Amino acid sequence: KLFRSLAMTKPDRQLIAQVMLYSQGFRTAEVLANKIVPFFKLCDEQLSSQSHYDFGLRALKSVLVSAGNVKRERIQKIKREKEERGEAVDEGEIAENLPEQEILIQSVCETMVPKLVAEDIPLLFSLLSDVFPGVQYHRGEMTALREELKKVCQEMYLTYGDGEEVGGMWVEKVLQLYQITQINHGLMMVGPSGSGKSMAWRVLLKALERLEGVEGVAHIIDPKAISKDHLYGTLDPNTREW
Amino acid sequence: DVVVPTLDTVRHEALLYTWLAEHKPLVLCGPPGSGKTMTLFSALRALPD
Amino acid sequence: IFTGSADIKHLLPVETQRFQSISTEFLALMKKVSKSPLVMDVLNIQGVQ
Amino acid sequence: YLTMTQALEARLGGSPFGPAGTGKTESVKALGHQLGRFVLVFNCDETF
Amino acid sequence: AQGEMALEEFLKQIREVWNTYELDLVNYQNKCRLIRGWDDLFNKVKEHI
Amino acid sequence: MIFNNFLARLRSIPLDESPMLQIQRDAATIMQPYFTSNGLVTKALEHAFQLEHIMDLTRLRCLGSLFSMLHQACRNV
Amino acid sequence: KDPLFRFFEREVKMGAKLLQDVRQDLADVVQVCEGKKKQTNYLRTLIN
Numbered sequence A: 001k002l003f004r005s006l007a008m009t010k011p012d013r014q015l016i017a018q019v020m021l022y023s024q025g026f027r028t029a030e031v032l033a034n035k036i037v038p039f040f041k042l043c044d045e046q047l048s049s050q051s052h053y054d055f056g057l058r059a060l061k062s063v064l065v066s067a068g069n070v071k072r073e074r075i076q077k078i079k080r081e082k083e084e085r086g087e088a089v090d091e092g093e094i095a096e097n098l099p100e101q102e103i104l105i106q107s108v109c110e111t112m113v114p115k116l117v118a119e120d121i122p123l124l125f126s127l128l129s130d131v132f133p134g135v136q137y138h139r140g141e142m143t144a145l146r147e148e149l150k151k152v153c154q155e156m157y158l159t160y161g162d163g164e165e166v167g168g169m170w171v172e173k174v175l176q177l178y179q180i181t182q183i184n185h186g187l188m189m190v191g192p193s194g195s196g197k198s199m200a201w202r203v204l205l206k207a208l209e210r211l212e213g214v215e216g217v218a219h220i221i222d223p224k225a226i227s228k229d230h231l232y233g234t235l236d237p238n239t240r241e242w
Numbered sequence B: 001d002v003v004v005p006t007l008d009t010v011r012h013e014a015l016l017y018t019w020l021a022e023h024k025p026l027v028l029c030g031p032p033g034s035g036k037t038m039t040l041f042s043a044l045r046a047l048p049d
Numbered sequence C: 001i002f003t004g005s006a007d008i009k010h011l012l013p014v015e016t017q018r019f020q021s022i023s024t025e026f027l028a029l030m031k032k033v034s035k036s037p038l039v040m041d042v043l044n045i046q047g048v049q
Numbered sequence D: 001y002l003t004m005t006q007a008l009e010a011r012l013g014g015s016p017f018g019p020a021g022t023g024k025t026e027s028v029k030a031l032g033h034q035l036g037r038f039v040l041v042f043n044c045d046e047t048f
Numbered sequence E: 001a002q003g004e005m006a007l008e009e010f011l012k013q014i015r016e017v018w019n020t021y022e023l024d025l026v027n028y029q030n031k032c033r034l035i036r037g038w039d040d041l042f043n044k045v046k047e048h049i
Numbered sequence F: 001m002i003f004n005n006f007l008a009r010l011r012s013i014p015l016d017e018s019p020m021l022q023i024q025r026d027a028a029t030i031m032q033p034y035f036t037s038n039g040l041v042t043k044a045l046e047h048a049f050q051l052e053h054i055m056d057l058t059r060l061r062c063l064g065s066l067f068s069m070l071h072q073a074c075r076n077v
Numbered sequence G: 001k002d003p004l005f006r007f008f009e010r011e012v013k014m015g016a017k018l019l020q021d022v023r024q025d026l027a028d029v030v031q032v033c034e035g036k037k038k039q040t041n042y043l044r045t046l047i048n
C-alpha cells in the first residue's frame, strides 16, 4: 500500500528502433526499423526453442548500438581509403553512398549468429533474405588474429584449422567469441561438456596477448563450489562489518 | 585383508593399477558389498608410495 | 637382510614396506648421481643434503 | 512518467513491475535524471 | 705480481680439481652403482680447506 | 581433433617429466592409422554409444581413459 | 524459404520427440508392472 504500481509489459520496440536509428544518422531509419523489429519477432517465433535464446529489447538495443558503431567505422574507413586513393572526401556523398541495410545486417549477424544452433543458421539467413532481399553478409577476415591463433594452437598442441578443414568450426567459434567480447562486457559460452569452450577462450586470450601487446590475466571461479556468502561476501550480523 | 583371486578380481586389479598409475581420478560403481573397496585396497597394495 | 631373508616379509611386514620405500628413494637419488658423477653436479642436486 | 510523478506527489514510492527487459530500471533512471536527481541502483537480494 | 700468483694458482688448481673430480662408482650385484673412494675424497677436501 | 592433440602430446611431452620420448614417438607412429576418422577407435566409440552403461556415456571420459592407459602401455615398454 | 514449412517442421520435431519420450516411459512402466525390470529412481517418481 506504500507504492503506486505500474505494469509495463510490452515496450514500444518499433518506436525505439525508429527514433534511435534516426538519431544515429540513418536516413532510412523508418524502413530500417519497420524491417528490423518484425525480423526480431520472426526470429523469436520461427527459430527452434532454446534455453539460450533472447530476442527482447536488450538484444535490439545492442543490435542498434552496434549498427551505429559499424556505420561510424565504415565512414572512417571510407574516408581513409579515399584519402589514400585521391582527394574527393565530402560528407554528403559518403552519407548518401552508404549501404545502411548492409550495416544493419552485419550488426545483426555479428550479434545473433554466435548464439544460434547449427540447424538454425540456414533459417536465420533465409529470414534475413526474406526481410532484407539482396543484402548479403561478408564477415571480415582477421589475418593477424588468425595467425596469432595458429601460433598459439601450435604452441599448446591445439589443432588449428580454417574454412571447412578439421578445426575450422572451432576457429570460427573463437573468432565469434572475440567479436562478442568486443561488443559485450558480459560473455557466456553454452555447449555440451567438452565442446572446446575452455580451450577456445584460453587460446583467444593468449592470441590477444601476443597480438595487442597487453597481457591477459584470467581468474577462474567455480560459483557453485562455494556458498554464496563465500562468493559475494558477508555482512557481519553483530558488528555490521563487511 | 585376504583376497581370493578371481577373473573379475584380477581384471579389475589390472585396470585400477593402470588408472591410478598416472594419478588419474576414477570411480568404482557397483552394488553395495560388491568388492569395490577391497579391489581398490588390493590395488594399492601394489603401489607402496 | 631385507632382500635375502624371505621370512622377514612374513614376520616384519610394515617395516619391510618402509625399507622398500627408502630403497626406492635411495636408488632414485643415486641414479641421479650416476647420470652425473661430477662432484659439483651432485652437490647441486636440489635438497640433496 | 505520469504514474511515477503521481506517486511522487502523494509522497508514495513507485513500483514498476513486469517481465524482465521492458525497461523498468532504465525508465526510473531516465525519470530521475529528467528531474536532475541522484539515482542509485541497488541489486537487492536476500542479504539486504 | 709474482707473489700473488701463488694464491691465484691455488684458486685455479682448486677450481680445476673440483670441475674435473668424479665420484668413483662401481656396480653392486647389478642392483645399484655404489660409491667408493671415500678416503682420497676426504683427504682432498680437507687439504683444500 | 582430440586424436591429433593426444598424438601431439605423446610425441612432445615425455611421461617422466630421451629414450622415453623415442618410445613415445614409436608408439604414436604405430597407433596413427587407428587414430583416424572412420578408424577402429571411431567405429568402436560410435558402437559403444549404442550400448547401455551404468552411468551416462560421455565421449571424453572414454577418450581420457584410453589415453591414460596407453600412456601406461608406453610406461610398460 | 516457406515460413509455413518452417513452423510445421518445428511442430513435428517437438511432437515426435515428446512422442517417443511418452511411449518409452509407458513401455518402461508396463515392463515394471510385469516384474520384468527393476524400478529406478526416475521410474519410481513416474510410478508414484
Ligand SMILES: Nc1ncnc2c1ncn2[C@@H]1O[C@H](COP(=O)(O)OP(=O)(O)OP(=O)(O)O)[C@@H](O)[C@H]1O
Residues within 6 Å of the ligand: A157, A158, A159, A160, A167, A170, A191, A192, A193, A194, A195, A196, A197, A198, A199, A200, F001, F002, F005
Ligand atoms: N581445438 C582443439 N584441438 C584439439 N584438441 C582440442 C581442441 N579444443 C579442445 N581440445 C581438447 O579436447 C578436450 C576438450 O576440453 P575443453 O576444456 O577444451 O572443452 P570444454 O567444452 O570447455 O569442456 P567442459 O565444459 O566439459 O569443461 C580437451 O582434452 C582439450 O585438450
Ligand SMILES: Nc1ncnc2c1ncn2[C@@H]1O[C@H](COP(=O)(O)OP(=O)(O)O)[C@@H](O)[C@H]1O
Residues within 6 Å of the ligand: B002, B003, B004, B005, B006, B009, B031, B032, B033, B034, B035, B036, B037, B038, B039
Ligand atoms: N574375490 C574375493 N575374494 C575374497 N573375498 C571377496 C571377494 N569378492 C568379495 N569378497 C568379500 O565381499 C566383501 C566386499 O565388501 P566391500 O568390498 O566392503 O563392498 P564395497 O566395496 O561395496 O564397500 C568383502 O568383505 C570380501 O570379504
Ligand SMILES: Nc1ncnc2c1ncn2[C@@H]1O[C@H](COP(=O)(O)OP(=O)(O)O)[C@@H](O)[C@H]1O
Residues within 6 Å of the ligand: A011, A016, A057, A058, A061, D019, D020, D021, D022, D023, D024, D025, D026, D027
Ligand atoms: N524507452 C526506451 N528508450 C530506449 N531504450 C530503452 C527504453 N526502454 C528500455 N530500453 C532499453 O532496454 C534495455 C533493458 O532495460 P532494463 O530497464 O534493464 O530492463 P528491466 O526493465 O528488466 O530492468 C536497456 O538497455 C534500455 O536501453
Ligand SMILES: [Mg+2]
Residues within 6 Å of the ligand: A194, A195, A196, A197, A198, A199
Ligand atoms: Mg570446459
Ligand SMILES: [Mg+2]
Residues within 6 Å of the ligand: D024, D025, D026
Ligand atoms: Mg531491471
